[PDB]
Design a protein around this ligand. Structure first.
Ligand SMILES: C[S@@+](CC[C@H](N)C(=O)[O-])C[C@H]1O[C@@H](n2cnc3c(N)ncnc32)[C@H](O)[C@@H]1O
Ligand SMILES: C[S@@+](CC[C@H](N)C(=O)[O-])C[C@H]1O[C@@H](n2cnc3c(N)ncnc32)[C@H](O)[C@@H]1O
Ligand SMILES: Nc1ncnc2c1ncn2[C@@H]1O[C@H](COP(=O)(O)O)[C@@H](O)[C@H]1O
Ligand SMILES: Nc1ncnc2c1ncn2[C@@H]1O[C@H](COP(=O)(O)O)[C@@H](O)[C@H]1O
Ligand SMILES: [Cl-]
Ligand SMILES: [Cl-]
Ligand SMILES: [Cl-]
Lengths: 442, 442
């Protein structure tokens, strides 16, 4: 009888599915976690076009497992306590059409035995802290990596060191240390455990998909360090830029988080409303919240200029500078400038034409834009002290201009006629050269 | 200069690619491992239809990496010694068309950072024993699992405890303990290290493909325990049965290995030359060697009978027994019998028709086949002491037959007319019942 099986539970941790007579006894009601988990189930089931195979690690009394089988999922629940699995099976038998199996076993051994494709979604709620406590953080990171490797999505509720109990002392400094080796992760909620006032965060993690409520797609590779608060995911015709505003440990000062926030926000604003006369990459999706923000854009051909420079690849500096200057002059005509023209913000296509790819540093108002013209000289010099004729003649001409006349329209016009300009080395000069060489050091 | 870089190597472990003046100095010539690795490169490149991305872990002086880049591979080599990477890079620069990159780094951190699809083939030759020695066997198993998870194939040369040095003591009992958690593995050679007379085995490992020289295909799931010396891999229209004759530890006695060998051999012989009047599954590939044997067959629909029995699924015992008896009678007419008719050797399709799926126990000559008819009664009883009318009447009729008349043609004929046979419970009987009930216990 169910009555007996429930009584023999060491703890009624969860609601007993279909049996509200124990709801008052359950440590956690599970309705809040279930609301969120069913939303994510539906998103992923919609994306894949079918009901999911779900793995429930430390499934306890089966509530999540049965609740998803109720919606058509095929589920396997694992728990190392016989008493818990006895209840899960007795509940499944009351619901014979649910495709639900339960097994006694250890999460560590199950994860080692998993095969990729067997399960689409795994859930691990409030269980990994027990594995941390007995086996340490590094083994848990590897288990969670494998779990992500073999599924399409993982949902974790993770206990945290701020919880007031003795086992909190063995927890990592931040729960994100258990998952940050995985490719994609997002905080999706925080839940009251009824053990204390400290809530547990729930994360959605994937090694195969971008999972954003509006955009759910496989990616084939990703990157953290460009050229660690920013991650880039590459799919067939998209790049998803994912910025963390909220990072663990020291990592971001207040100012840096706000700048992550500012840049991504500014980039979204510009790209959703670009200026006429400028070909901006197209925007497929975007959003922001307290922890992070994201932007999914069309994927552009080419390589990042700084990589080409680092990997000593052959470059046409004329075509790169010409094309970039042309786009900068067109921006300026529409009252836009870019505050940070550097090799890692420039992409060069197969025909050696260049374009900006980060619009975080775009600005709309201001003497000016004289400073930006100055840095652009450094850019030029780093792209190559190092300027042969007629690049040097170009710069010398700019330097002879009154400063109120410095702007990107002028820079471009002089650049186009640089072969006609007088020879800098024939003049006393000589300072423009030394100031940028010191700048280009500085 | 290369001269200087080579001199500064703590050890010239490998041949210096393109520079035979150091071949006499190299600890290992590498030509034997390279012959085998290039063969496996070609097989996998042929299967995938393209040049491969290859990862070389602990790449030392770059010999394998450069030698594969020479054949069109794109390679990344990793080593934690700066001196080694300096030589690798200097060699790559002598061969500018090779797509070869090298990085200083630790194998543990690289594996954690890998993404699935980035590399098709990883090689790890004589390097993991260093990671075992510092981090232990369990962490190395997890690293190797992840390596297999993220690639299509892995080639490992593994040091072994029989090597006479002090670090041998930290090695596992058998090198297969580092890899047996991976889905597919095969010994492909054994190599002289020049440190001692003990050779190191080279394994080909995969978590995604069956990699047999004649048959190279993805699989989507696999299984060890049927219903651990036998593994089954399932692909789109095939099942590959892989039997180990050579197993680690105690696992197989001499007799058991020979029986693995005998069964698989016998199954290959039968299926490649099946008897007329019997629909045998078709054979796609097969082979045997000292360590193991394999058989790739067409994949049959249905479920294994023993699973259906265990998972209490609905079965039609009439249709199952009828169909099986019909095929057993047709075998017998061609002078073939099956020595081991049990639920785990029988597959039942959607229309409840049954067939044998393991032909290891097929035999061709012998009083006989009286023992087999007897077991078939146990089979019958386990499929349900437990026999209602008219199954009991069937068995009673058989038992009244002189023993020289017991055979599967008779069993089938009586089975088809069982509704007409006299009622066993009306007779003294009663023993046939008790002998099989004791047999069915026994
Ligand atoms: C605190 S409860 C969480 C239950 C459930 N996941 C939930 O959040 O509603 C932890 C559960 O995991 C199980 N468990 C703990 N460590 C385990 C392990 N190493 N393998 C399998 N089950 C484990 C316990 O038996 C218990 O049912
Ligand atoms: C015995 S040698 C084998 C070299 C090469 N794989 C071969 O078999 O021809 C081991 C190599 O691995 C490197 N190595 C050892 N442990 C390493 C680690 N943890 N990460 C990166 N490289 C490592 C050593 O620097 C050395 O080059
Ligand atoms: N729209 C895009 N299309 C292609 N690559 C991009 C795009 N946006 C960013 N990247 C790439 O993102 C990587 C590193 O991030 P980032 O700082 O954006 O350059 C570089 O390799 C860029 O080429
Ligand atoms: N030709 C085949 N087609 C489909 N399944 C097979 C075939 N051969 C073996 N199996 C399956 O292999 C699994 C376990 O191995 P076995 O002992 O061969 O039954 C069972 O689930 C069988 O259904
Ligand atoms: Cl946890
Ligand atoms: Cl580990
Ligand atoms: Cl090794």
């Amino acid at each position: 009888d169910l009555n007996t099986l429930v009584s023999e539970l060491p703890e009624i941790y969860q609601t007993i599915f279909g049996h509200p007579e124990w709801d008052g006894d359950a440590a956690r009601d599970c309705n809040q976690r279930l609301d969120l988990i069913t939303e994510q189930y539906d998103n992923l089931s919609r994306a894949l076009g079918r009901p999911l195979n779900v793995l429930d690690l430390g499934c306890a009394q089966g509530f999540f497992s049965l609740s998803l089988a109720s919606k058509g999922a095929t589920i396997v629940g694992i728990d190392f306590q016989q008493e818990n699995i006895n209840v899960c099976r007795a509940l499944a038998e009351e619901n014979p059409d649910f495709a639900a199996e339960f097994r006694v076993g250890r999460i560590e051994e199950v994860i080692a035995a998993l095969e990729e494709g067997e399960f689409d979604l795994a859930i691990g709620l409030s269980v990994f802290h027990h594995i941390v406590h007995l086996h340490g953080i590094d083994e848990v990171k590897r288990l969670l990596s494998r779990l992500a490797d073999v599924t399409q999505a993982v949902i974790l509720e993770l206990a945290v060191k701020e919880e007031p109990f003795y086992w909190g002392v063995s927890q990592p400094d931040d729960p994100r240390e258990l998952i940050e080796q995985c490719a994609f992760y997002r905080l999706i909620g925080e839940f009251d455990t009824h053990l204390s006032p400290v809530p547990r965060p729930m994360y959605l993690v994937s090694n195969h998909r971008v999972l954003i409520n509006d955009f759910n797609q496989p990616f084939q590779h990703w990157q953290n360090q460009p050229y660690r608060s920013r991650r880039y995911f590459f799919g067939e015709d998209y790049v998803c830029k994912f910025f963390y505003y909220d990072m663990p440990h020291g990592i971001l000062t207040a100012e840096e988080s706000q700048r992550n926030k500012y840049e991504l926000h500014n980039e979204i604003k510009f790209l959703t409303q670009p200026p006429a006369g400028f070909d901006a990459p197209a925007v497929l999706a975007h959003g922001e919240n307290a922890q992070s923000g994201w932007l999914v854009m069309e994927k552009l051909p080419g390589r990042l200029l700084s990589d080409m420079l680092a990997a000593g690849e052959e470059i046409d500096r004329e075509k790169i500078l010409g094309s970039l200057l042309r786009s900068l002059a067109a921006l300026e005509k529409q009252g836009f400038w870019h505050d940070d023209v550097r090799p890692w913000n420039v992409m060069v296509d197969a025909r050696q034409h260049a374009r900006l790819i980060d619009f975080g540093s775009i600005v709309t108002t201001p003497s000016w834009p004289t400073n930006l013209v100055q840095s652009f000289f450094v850019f030029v010099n780093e792209l190559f002290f190092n300027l042969p004729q007629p690049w040097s003649n170009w710069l010398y001409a700019v330097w002879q201009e009154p400063v109120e006349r410095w702007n990107f329209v002028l820079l471009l016009a002089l650049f186009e006629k640089k072969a006609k300009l007088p020879s800098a080395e024939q003049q006393r000069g000589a300072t423009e050269q030394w100031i940028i060489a010191q700048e280009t050091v500085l």
